[PDB]
Design a protein around this ligand. Structure first.
Ligand SMILES: C[As](C)(=O)[O-]
Ligand code: NA
Ligand SMILES: [Zn+2]
Ligand SMILES: [Zn+2]
Ligand SMILES: [Zn+2]
Ligand SMILES: [Zn+2]
Ligand SMILES: [Zn+2]
Ligand SMILES: [Zn+2]
Ligand SMILES: [Zn+2]
Length: 77
């Protein structure tokens, strides 16, 4: 599985959303129904899956699926 696939799987699982709905340009809050808890638990799930830290100032701007994919691809452990 590619990093795109693994990031999308974690997002779908954390947010209770179906894969077909996790499009690359989807907004976590505006398309995938993320509530405030979801935002911190999603960051935590990505950090744990990829063994990487995400600074909160960058999480605040990480508002789409592609933003999360690009962060993870760009910070490989
Ligand atoms: C706990 As699981 C179904 O993402 O391996
Ligand atoms: Na795919
Ligand atoms: Zn899984
Ligand atoms: Zn849905
Ligand atoms: Zn949208
Ligand atoms: Zn951690
Ligand atoms: Zn940890
Ligand atoms: Zn760890
Ligand atoms: Zn951490």
């Amino acid at each position: 599985s590619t990093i795109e696939e693994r990031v999308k799987k974690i997002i779908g699982e954390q947010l209770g959303v179906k894969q077909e709905e996790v499009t690359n340009n989807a907004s976590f809050v505006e398309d995938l129904g993320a509530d405030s808890l979801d935002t911190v638990e999603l960051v935590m799930a990505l950090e744990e899956e990829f063994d990487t830290e995400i600074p909160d100032e960058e999480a605040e701007k990480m508002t789409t699926v592609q933003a999360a994919i690009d962060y993870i691809n760009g910070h490989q452990a």
